[PDB]
Design a protein around this nucleic acid. Sequence first.
DNA 1: TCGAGAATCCCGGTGCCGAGGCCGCTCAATTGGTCGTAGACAGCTCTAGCACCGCTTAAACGCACGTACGCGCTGTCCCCCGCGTTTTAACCGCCAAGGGGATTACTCCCTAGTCTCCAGGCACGTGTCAGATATATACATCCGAT
DNA 2: ATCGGATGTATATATCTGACACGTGCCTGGAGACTAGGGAGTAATCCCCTTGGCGGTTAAAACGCGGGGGACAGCGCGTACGTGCGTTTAAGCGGTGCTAGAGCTGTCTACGACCAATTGAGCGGCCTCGGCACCGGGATTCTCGA
Lengths: 93, 93, 87, 88, 107, 107, 455, 455, 98, 95
Amino acid sequence: TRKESYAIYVYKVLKQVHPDTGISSKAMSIMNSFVNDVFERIAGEASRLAHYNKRSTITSREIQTAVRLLLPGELAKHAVSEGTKAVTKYTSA
Amino acid sequence: TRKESYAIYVYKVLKQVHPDTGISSKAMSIMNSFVNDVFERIAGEASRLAHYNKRSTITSREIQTAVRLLLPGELAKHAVSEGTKAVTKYTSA
Amino acid sequence: AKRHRKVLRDNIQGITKPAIRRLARRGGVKRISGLIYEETRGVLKVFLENVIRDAVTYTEHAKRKTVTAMDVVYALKRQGRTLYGFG
Amino acid sequence: AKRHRKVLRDNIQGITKPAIRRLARRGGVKRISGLIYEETRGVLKVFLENVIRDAVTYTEHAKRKTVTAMDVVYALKRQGRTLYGFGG
Amino acid sequence: AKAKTRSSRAGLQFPVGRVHRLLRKGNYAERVGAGAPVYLAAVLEYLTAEILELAGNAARDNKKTRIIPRHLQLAVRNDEELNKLLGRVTIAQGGVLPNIQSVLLPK
Amino acid sequence: AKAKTRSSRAGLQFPVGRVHRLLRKGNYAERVGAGAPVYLAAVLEYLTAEILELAGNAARDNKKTRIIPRHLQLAVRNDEELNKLLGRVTIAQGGVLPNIQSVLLPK
Amino acid sequence: EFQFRESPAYVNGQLRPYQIQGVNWLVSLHKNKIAGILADEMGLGKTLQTISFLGYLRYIEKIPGPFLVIAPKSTLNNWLREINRWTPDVNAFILQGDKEERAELIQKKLLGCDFDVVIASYEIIIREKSPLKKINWEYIIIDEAHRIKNEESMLSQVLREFTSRNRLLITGTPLQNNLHELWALLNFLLPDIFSDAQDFDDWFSSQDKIVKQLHTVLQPFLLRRIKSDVETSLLPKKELNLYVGMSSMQKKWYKKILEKDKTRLLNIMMQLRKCCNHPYLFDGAEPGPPYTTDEHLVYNAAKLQVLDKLLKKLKEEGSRVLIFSQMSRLLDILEDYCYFRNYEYCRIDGSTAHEDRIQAIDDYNAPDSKKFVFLLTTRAGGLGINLTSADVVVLYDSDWNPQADLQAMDRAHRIGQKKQVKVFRLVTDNSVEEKILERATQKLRLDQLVIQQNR
Amino acid sequence: EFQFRESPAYVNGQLRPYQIQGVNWLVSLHKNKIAGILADEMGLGKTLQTISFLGYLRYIEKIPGPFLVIAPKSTLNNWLREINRWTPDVNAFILQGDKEERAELIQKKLLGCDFDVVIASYEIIIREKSPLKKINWEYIIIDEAHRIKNEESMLSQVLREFTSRNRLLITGTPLQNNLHELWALLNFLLPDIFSDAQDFDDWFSSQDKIVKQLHTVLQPFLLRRIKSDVETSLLPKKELNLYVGMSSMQKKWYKKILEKDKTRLLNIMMQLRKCCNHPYLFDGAEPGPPYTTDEHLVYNAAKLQVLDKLLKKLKEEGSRVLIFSQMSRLLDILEDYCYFRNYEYCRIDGSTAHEDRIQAIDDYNAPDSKKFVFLLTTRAGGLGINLTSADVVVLYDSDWNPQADLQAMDRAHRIGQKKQVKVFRLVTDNSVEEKILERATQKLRLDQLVIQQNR
Amino acid sequence: KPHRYRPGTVALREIRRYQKSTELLIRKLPFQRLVREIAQDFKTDLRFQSSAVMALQEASEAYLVALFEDTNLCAIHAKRVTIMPKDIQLARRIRGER
Amino acid sequence: RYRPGTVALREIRRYQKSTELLIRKLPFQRLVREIAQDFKTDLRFQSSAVMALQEASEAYLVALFEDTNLCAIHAKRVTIMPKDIQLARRIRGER
DNA sequence: TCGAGAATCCCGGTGCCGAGGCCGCTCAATTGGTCGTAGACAGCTCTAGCACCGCTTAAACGCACGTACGCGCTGTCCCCCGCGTTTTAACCGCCAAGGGGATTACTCCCTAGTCTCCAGGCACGTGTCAGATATATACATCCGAT
DNA sequence: ATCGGATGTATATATCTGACACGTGCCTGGAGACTAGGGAGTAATCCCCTTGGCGGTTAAAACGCGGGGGACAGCGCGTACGTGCGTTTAAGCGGTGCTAGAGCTGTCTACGACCAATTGAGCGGCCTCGGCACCGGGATTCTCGA
Ligand SMILES: Nc1ncnc2c1ncn2[C@@H]1O[C@H](COP(=O)(O)OP(=O)(O)OP(=O)(O)O)[C@@H](O)[C@H]1O
Ligand SMILES: Nc1ncnc2c1ncn2[C@@H]1O[C@H](COP(=O)(O)OP(=O)(O)OP(=O)(O)O)[C@@H](O)[C@H]1O
Ligand SMILES: [Mg+2]
Ligand SMILES: [Mg+2]
């Protein structure tokens, strides 16, 4: 049966960052599991925030706050900048 | 408004265990916190068990498995004893 | 010039030497080297920085302006130190 | 009698002294007390007991009979030791 | 007919109906089987009973008749099962266990 | 009308539709806002880019043109911030960081 | 009944007729078994009528008994000296000092019942409550009654626990903020009679349908004598408001506060009040270090800059000055200013020890009174004390409650002044001080224009 | 074409006529540019025809060339000695030994092209593949062809990579389990010709519509000569099944396994087989410690208990015994038994080193043959070796594949036996051994009753 | 001559009496001022609940007490009785927080 | 002959540079199976499952030896001893 | 060594306050029908785990040696502890103002549910090139005679 | 302190080789259009709880001084361990047979959701009393100088 992974997307990002580098399959599995792990962390944190504030909806505000909580230091500010940029562009189109 | 808690239930359990002692307000706040904490732990673990196995239902056997996973050593056996006892009695009537 | 009495020269110094000695004694320590107090203050400051950062994040998300006991409790639980007795 | 040659007298002794030295060398250790190996074996055995207990619990909840890499991965994540590179 | 509480039917002292509602509004799963609340209620009741008897004994050893956070902390930290369970929990007003390392004691 | 992927509208490489589905099928909340998948996909994409860039550099230092778990481990444990992020995480076939305590080295 | 026509024989000195009327009022209340408020104005010998009534209860009805007199800390020596002057035949002492001394006094005298009159401050009462609760008090006398205007104040609660045959209240300013204060006081006086808050409130709901009822209900429970209709021998007070702007430093800091300019600013009110009073109260605005006190103080503070001119002028007129303030730190600033100006102050405050307070008052009321200006604070040293030597009262900064200013200005314009009293209240133009002045005026009109006009 | 009428002059010794026919068959295949399977029965000098054909290719068509002969490890010395006996004029050597010696041999001879015939085992081939792949081999000869019956076996894959002018296969048992094995072998022989698995399968889909087609397709690719229609001089084998029960220990352990009685039991089959063979193969069932070998071994094992009687009896008849088993440990048990019984065994197994194997075989085939019984295992020492000295073959336990038993029993009943061969297969009543016997019988009938009846 | 205890006895008495009790050990007002000053650096002009500050103090003292127990064990391991900065540093290093 | 210690540093370098597993597959597999028999008899395994267990175990032991070395250096030594292991475990909170 | 002596423990007495017990809402849990779909069940199939053996070969194990490292002892000194005095900063209560949190009502707009396409992601071959191995070579380095 | 010679280690090179990147066909899951409904944003209100400073009190903190005991350095003495060598034994890979078990498919069906009505259980409010916290006073115990 079909199993879904983040393989093709991680590969696209890699070819934008290092346009001439490859990644072996074991490392590809490592990156896939890293992506799933961090996704689950952020999603769970947003869920708990929305529950605390007695809301019933996960919005960009909750995702933003969860990113602030989880990612430390410079990663927090850079990631939030990236995400707000993306949502801005998405709404504009 | 109205805040619900486990105060009266913890009081009943205490009056069944030590029919003559008391519990101060801070201590019953602590018991309330403990109850909510362990409830949320078990419920979260049961939820992710059901998710792993691709069920969409939380049932007594996922509660049982989550209990065996959380509670250590001798606690788990007696806890499961008590829970199976209760569900058996419940379904008899 | 009586208006220029003094200032306690910092808030971190408000954690006095005797208070640290009392915390050490509760921990079970018998002799205390004289330099312990300074990095004890440093350690405490770092810990508080982390927790207060988290609690202020929670408060900002809820659009409030008062930090509350529940916000502090959430911050502690997130960092992995659950606290019983405040909600 | 060639029937009764020998047995490894345990499985836990299969973790040979040279292997423990190699793990210690990777950990950055230079000189090793001769008594270390028994405590190392005990520590390892306890660690394995915890993880395997959890993995078997997951397995038999799923009503299977085969312990799988994902059962082990969930057990470790439960323990607080996430493991990257084995699915999930 | 005449209403009987699920807590009554299972002979419990914790609220089966309330636990069921908390499960169902907690976003744990899309559906909730009928015996999940009963099992969870029984388990929480049992755990509370254990901590309570231990804390009551701890109080009684102090010639006292009301439980306080000090007693709760002593009860928890004096047995390995509950100490392991609540291994990362702070109990306000709990104090610490009386303990002095032996090498510090006078010769 | 011709179809445009949400990922394209946001100009991402990670898939917004898949993330949206995973959010809605993961029992995280009753409803899911429109910009949550976009915002989350952007964040995951950024983090992956960060790790990949570091690991590619680490590989190139070894005259290698394929990332391997060793390179990922080197990148992560040498970047202190990612190291803080992945403090409790084991990377298979990763190895360890070369580190010898100063006392051991010969005089 | 016993109408007590003339001046007491046993009481020394001659008391004026309205004092006899008040004593008669007290005796009537005592026989009728009701307690009332001697709410006479500031300055008249309320202490004197109280002492006279005690002399009654000792020499006519023959009940020396236990007597408890509660007062602000600063007036305890005043009460002691006065009771030793008018009827120097009663066992009276001040229950004050270190806790060791206090327990010693309790064991010797208080438990030995070797006393007739006990004078204590509020803090001692709330502190030494267990031993005092073991005495069946006959009269409990509370000076400065508006102190118990809140019924949850632990002073109020504790007073509601003593065994008292009867009560009696003194205050120059009975009505402070709203109606509820009166119910608070009366619930202490007659707990059984009133015992109702909402009933009291809605019986009036704050024309003639009420204010007349207001008078009628309290006619027997209160007695007031305005100084204009009773004394008249006293030159009347002359008040003045010296409107001022702000200096450069003041203006700068005032904006900096306005547009929120790493230091904590939560109650903007107090920050603005500090700014208007004197910017040096903010840390660092003073040039330095080194910190020198020569002259930069005066000119960059409109309040003090005007003050120097006015004070110097009055010095050539050769009068004497009282300075009231709301803040102890500003008091320190003023003290440093006089240190520069080579004046002889006699500062009093909330931190000043008891005997130091006594010594300071006696210094300023000395014959030839070596001291020129006397530094006060409206709360600590703004009650009861009798600085009749001076003649010019300067309110540096207004208060949120006007009666706190009335007491302060009346600490000099009282009986035996024999001068003209000039009160110079300082205000800052285009500042919150105007607003606090307005609110104080409304609170004060709510009082004078309604309740005590007939009295 | 060249029909090669009589016995080769260059080949020593006289070969029987059907051997000449086989040589002619090989020559025909060589000229026609097709490769086939010399699938002659067990026991006839298949090696001899192969050597003869090589002598052809060297002395008639004049191609010494590189020759590669792959064989089981135990038969390498046999091939070497035989090629040195029949045509002692060819450069032949065994590529065996330590890896150091192996690399040394490669560098000296293999890379020096100073060879004509190379004999190697399967493991060496799969190990030493890089240097051997650098030789354009003329003929690659595989003895015991059923070893490559699985096309994913890395031996199969590696053989599918050598540069070979032509191939040739030898096996006494060509058809092992099903049809697919034949396609596997032929895809090695003629990869281009067949190259099809499902087509081969469905061309027949396993009466007359198929089995006749089966014969027709492979008539030129195969050559068989049954011993009955060709030798006509060998005594026929006498087989026997000695049905036995179980002893007390055996019965006890058999149930204990049946109702699942802290040790791991996952393949119940092998556990039951161990039980039926000998319970002492289970740890601890033997009484002790101390562990003594006197007599408790024989009686509590029905297999061995019958064995002792039969072996002792045949000892008085004075014949010689071969013992085949599936398990090396049971072989150890038997060896200890003879140590008690003071017999002279010559055990061989999979762990036995090469020269030890040679020495053992030569000991047992010695004139006067000091040894009585010879211990074997069906896989390791159950192929090719020529133990004609003995006359009684005892199969201790049956195998899942009957041909593995056919080879074992034919290791003694081959040419130059000059005796009567009695094969005593031991079976256990009411045990799984009956089931494995049944399945082996079906697999064997699927073979004999269909394919090779005409041959 | 006046009565003096040995340099190690009063320490043991303090240990007993402070492990026996449960109250807070840092002065409430200085701790509150410190919390406010720290918190100002993330968002300016925050208000606090009294219970919030009390929760922070509970957690802070609990953390410090645990840290001092670990420090003491390290010092004993090094065959001393005096705890030192190197002991604190090692303890926090082992716990994976430095 | 090398002086005692030199080869220790050399092999430290080699093993910190490499990445492979250090315990043999069969010994570890037998140990895992034996331990598993005490929770549910007749279990099967996947090869990937046993490999996961070995990865996790070796990582854990390497970390423990790092902390043990830190403790031993703190006690002014170079030889690690069981008391160092026990101290590390207690501080980590595994006791 | 045994006689002061300071700290600690009971222990009875007092008060005090925080626990426990009682009285009206109100809202949320139980009952009774009605649906519809999640999963339990049966059947099939093919795959992957188990057990053994065969064969190779590298690592582990036992042994000998000598050295450098851990441990015990001594001495020094200095630094931290214990104790007394003064004052200052904490604590608790008062007293104002007012910011901000928490409820209520309205409505709108944003999300879900549905049906219809279609294109993007997955499983499956297939060529090929980055890298691991082996070989030889050069180089940094370490430990022992001048 | 300095050479000489082993010795390990790093590097360059040619060769497989097997793992990786790529190309193809399908299906299934995502995007579009549309409808309906309820969650959340907005505005108004009010009241309650925070903040700031002062007043009085008083206990703890800061300073200073005397002295002993705990850390640290130095030294000598076993002794345990690292380093080097020879054997074989156990591990590793593969080959075979096999069969249990795990995963896919199609069918009901029993169970859990959804909805409407009603009631009683739980929460907030309001009372008292007993359990505990001072508190003085004597007893006991332990410590430090003998
Ligand atoms: N009969 C009298 N003769 C002379 N002086 C008197 C007489 N009665 C009162 N005084 C004056 O009253 C002053 C004492 O203050 P007084 O007793 O008036 O305070 P009070 O207004 O009664 O009460 P409070 O303490 O509330 O101000 C003294 O200076 C004294 O000169
Ligand atoms: N021409 C011959 N003359 C005498 N003996 C022969 C001749 N050909 C074969 N043999 C006999 O064949 C025996 C060798 O075994 P043989 O070569 O028959 O095994 P195989 O059946 O050819 O192959 P496998 O090794 O598969 O059994 C020898 O004992 C030898 O006596
Ligand atoms: Mg007066
Ligand atoms: Mg042969």
